């Protein structure tokens, strides 16, 4: 409602740009619950190298509980193309949206906008 994030998403400075809308930590499967069946997942790619498959294992956990599924991606790495390609293939099968940010503020913006 006024968002629900996972306490496993703390630390992440993107929460610092979630200023225009109210948000709070809740125990939910996805990273952010934005509506009764809309939910997002954050994957900082740079971290994507450091132990990946987690984003893959993260979508199977979510399964199908939310209608609008979205993947917030922070492009914090040069020459990202390669990964985006294999991540996108994953999203069509998972039928979730692929969104691209490049800063912790930009993604933070993407959150105020989906609840707005």
């Amino acid at each position: 409602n006024s968002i629900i994030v996972s306490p496993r998403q703390r630390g992440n400075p993107v929460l610092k740009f979630v200023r225009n809308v109210p948000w709070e930590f809740g125990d939910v499967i996805p990273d952010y619950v934005l509506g009764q069946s809309t939910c997002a997942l954050f994957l900082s790619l740079r971290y994507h190298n450091l132990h990946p498959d987690y984003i893959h294992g993260r979508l199977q956990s979510l399964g199908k509980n939310f209608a609008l599924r979205v993947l917030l991606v922070q492009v914090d790495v040069k020459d990202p193309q390669q990964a985006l390609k294999e991540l996108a293939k994953m999203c069509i099968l998972a039928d979730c949206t692929l969104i691209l940010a490049w800063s912790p503020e930009e993604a933070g913006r993407y959150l105020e906008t989906y609840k707005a």
Binding site: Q9, V14, F42, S44, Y47, Y54
Partner: peptide, 11 residues
């Protein structure tokens, strides 16, 4: 610090 926990995000 550098304690990358879990959550698709570098820490």
């Amino acid at each position: 610090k550098i304690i990358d926990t879990g959550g698709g995000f570098i820490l």
